[PDB]
Amino acid sequence: SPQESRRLSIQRCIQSLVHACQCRNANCSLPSCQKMKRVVQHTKGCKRKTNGGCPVCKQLIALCCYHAKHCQENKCPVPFCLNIKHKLRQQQGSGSGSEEPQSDPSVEPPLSQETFSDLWKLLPENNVLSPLPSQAMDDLMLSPDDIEQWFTEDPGPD
């Protein structure tokens, strides 16, 4: 079924992200690795990320949100996963604060979370975690064909 092919394409994209994050070769021969290495390096240096939403940074965070919704690990190889999982828990009452990830200021990540709370404006706040009758809240924001388009349709003047 196309729902399975969609979930599988997203799972391949998540495995591409984990590979690129653990991979130490800038010249790695995988197209999956090269897509995610160039995207994570772009996202780390971009100034448009949350200035109305950069299409690279926004969709990398869409994939990290989808991954964090399935993930349970306390030291996962995905870069945004754990603090996204804290932000997802805060929408369900499993975490505290909104302008902070917890009631304590010393437990915050090295990156200022004013960026993180603005990443939370690029994705819908309720729709993604809304009450559900059957498992579909995952495929809700992705397709099997957009997995390439998000990263390969590089912006330009025309």
Binding positions for Zn ion, rule: CB under 5 A: 23, 28, 33, 46, 49, 54, 56-57, 71, 76, 78, 81
In whole angstroms, the minimum distance from the beta carbon of 137 to Zn ion comes to 17
> Which of 2, 121 has the CB closer to Zn ion?
121
CA of residue 49 relative to chain centroid, distance: 12
In whole angstroms, the minimum distance from the beta carbon of 24 to Zn ion comes to 8
In sequence order, the 6+-apart residues with CB closer than 8 A to the CB of 121 are 50
> Which of 81, 123 has the CB closer to Zn ion?
81
> Which of 54, 147 has the CB closer to Zn ion?
54
Pull the structure tokens for residue 98. Answer: 């909104």
* E strand segments, the chain: none
C-beta neighbour count of 9 within 10 angstroms = 17
In whole angstroms, the minimum distance from the beta carbon of 1 to Zn ion comes to 26
Q: Is 99 helix (H, G, I), strand (E, B) or coil?
A: coil
Which CA distances in Å does 16 have to 1, 72, 150? 23, 19, 14
> Which of 42, 117 has the CB closer to Zn ion?
42
In whole angstroms, the minimum distance from the beta carbon of 85 to Zn ion comes to 7
Pull the structure tokens for residue 73. Answer: 């690990």
